[PDB]
Amino acid sequence: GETLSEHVFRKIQSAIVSGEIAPGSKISEPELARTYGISRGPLREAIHRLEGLRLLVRVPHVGARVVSLSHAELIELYEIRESLEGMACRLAAERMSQAEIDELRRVLDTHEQQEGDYDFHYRIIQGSGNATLTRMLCGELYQLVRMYRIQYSTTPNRPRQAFAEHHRILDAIADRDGELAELLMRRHISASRRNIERQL
Amino acid sequence: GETLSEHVFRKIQSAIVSGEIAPGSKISEPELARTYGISRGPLREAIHRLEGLRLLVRVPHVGARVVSLSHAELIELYEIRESLEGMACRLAAERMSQAEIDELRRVLDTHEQQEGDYDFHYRIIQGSGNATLTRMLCGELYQLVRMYRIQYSTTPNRPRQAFAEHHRILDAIADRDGELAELLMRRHISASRRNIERQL
Ligand SMILES: [Zn+2]
Ligand SMILES: [Zn+2]
């Protein structure tokens, strides 16, 4: 079972990621507490966790604000993403069983929108054999990625460019070439960042 | 101000890291709740966070256990550490102001034990200009590092070997060579892992 402080966290985290609460919105704490009817005891525990995930920001006199969704935060998020997703492909090419790679191939063929992208990257991170890697990618970093993409959709020709990048990454993992797969993942993540930048 | 669930978390996290609670120890939940006298409402919120940090482990019928401190967990922890500390040096050589580098040089000269190591790595991660990087290194990963080193001290000749490795890393950062500094950091982190492995 979950605690009350955890139920409030994820329901707030979903409203921020999906866009129900706009970026930069001031969080009315006694007001939002009336929406769920729970004391401020465990409520600060929820807000403090969202500040650590850099979904909210602590303003010193005023209180908590939804993150700026700015250019500097985008560079911060894709720096770590490039390093973590890169080493995930390096370990996946080393550790993914054969049957794991064909399953990764099926998911690619069928999807031939942003959740099909999640499916491809999720297996690779899972195939890396590192649970701490999954917590930082799928648990923390992918939450801020999801709310940049909702506010800034992909450009018309991106899904075709990104799909070919996926095929080359999978082919390097199947060939057990971790050095090439890490390099291809970095280019693919860097291409995703430049897409969001062109719409800021 | 902090919440009660957060006060209990850090006091438990300190007892696990320092070694007051042995690795693999079964956590008696109603018993440990009597030690602090707080209901199980916010208590599960503390245990769940420690499982995410992989300091505890959830056993399905029994409950929570202190982490195994095994060889597989050591490889998991130093995989991410190599990638994150490596890119931290790459960004630090790009972004650390001049005055930041001399300050990093002073700390090295004076310390010429495991907290002097923390001081050197802390400035570099701080100099990387990435706050999310600091949260994952100093906040989460360094907690599991601290409890491996307490249970397994350094070998007699390690501080001399590690000190020279620090001087070469700082020299690459001062020369603004991010590619070399990232490579030197990886070798230095890999050397630290092999030290702990020799005592397992
Ligand atoms: Zn993708
Ligand atoms: Zn060191």
Q: What 3-state DSSP class applies to A54? A: coil
Contact B59, B28 (CB under 8 A): no
Q: Distance between CA B166 and CA A33 in Å, rounded?
A: 50
Q: Which amino acid, A130? A: N
**Domain ranges for chain A:** 1-68, 69-200
Which residues contact residue A97 at a Cβ distance below 8 angstroms, ignoring those fewer than 6 apart? Answer: none
DSSP strands (E only) in chain A? 56-59, 63-66
Torsion of CA A140, B122, A189, B52, to 10 degrees: -20
Nearest-10 crossing angle of helices A71-95, B71-95: 140
Please return the burial class of A160, using the count of CB atoms within 10 Å of its CB with bins 0-12, 13-18 and 19+.
exposed
Q: Can you tell me the distance from the alpha carbon of A122 to that of A127, in angstroms, rounded to the nearest whole number?
A: 8
Gap between the Cα atoms of A54 and A48, Å rounded? 10
The technique by which this structure was obtained is X-ray
Question: Which residues of B fall within a CB distance of 8 Å from A87?
Answer: 79-80, 82-83
CA of B84: which chain A residue's CA is closest? A83
- Overall resolution, Å: 2.6
Ligand nearest to the backbone CA of A145: 1
3-state SS of chain B is CCCHHHHHHHHHHHHHHHCCCCCCCECCHHHHHHHHCCCHHHHHHHHHHHHHCCCEEEECCCEEEECCCCHHHHHHHHHHHHHHHHHHHHHHHHHCCHHHHHHHHHHHHHHCCHHHHHHHHHHHHHHCCCHHHHHHHHHHHHHHHHHHHHHCCCCCCHHHHHHHHHHHHHHHHHCCCHHHHHHHHHHHHHHHHHHHHCCC
Cα A151 from chain centre: 14
The single residue listed with the structure tokens 């609460």 is A21
Q: In angstroms, rounded to a whole number, what is the distance separating the alpha carbons of residues B104 and B47?
A: 37
Token pair of A99 as six digits:
């049957």
Q: Is B30 exposed, middle or buried (0-12, 13-18, 19+ CB in 10 A)?
A: exposed
For A130, the closest chain B residue by CA position comes to B76
In 3-state terms, what secondary structure has residue A63?
A: strand
Structure tokens given for A98: 């054969």
Nearest-ligand number for the alpha carbon of B145: 2
Between the alpha carbon of residue A66 and those of residues A4, A23, A54, A99, A117, the distances in Å are 22, 5, 9, 43, 26
Test B45 with A3 for CB contact under 8 angstroms.
yes
Please give the distance of CA B57 from its chain centroid, rounded to a whole number: 18
Question: Which amino acid does the sequence have at A69?
Answer: L
**Token duo for residue A79:** 């720096």
Q: Which residues of A touch B1 (CB under 8 A)?
A: 44
Residues in chain A closer than 8 A to B41 (CB atoms) = 3-4, 42
Residue B58: beta bridge partners? B64
Q: Cα(B45)–Cα(B38) distance, rounded to whole angstroms?
A: 12
Q: At what angle do helices A114-127 and A71-95 cross, to 10 degrees?
A: 50
Q: Which amino acid, B148? A: Y
Task: Please name the residue that has the structure tokens 């930082």.
Answer: A136
Q: Which two tokens stand for residue A143?
A: 């939450």
Hey, what are B139's tokens?
């906040």
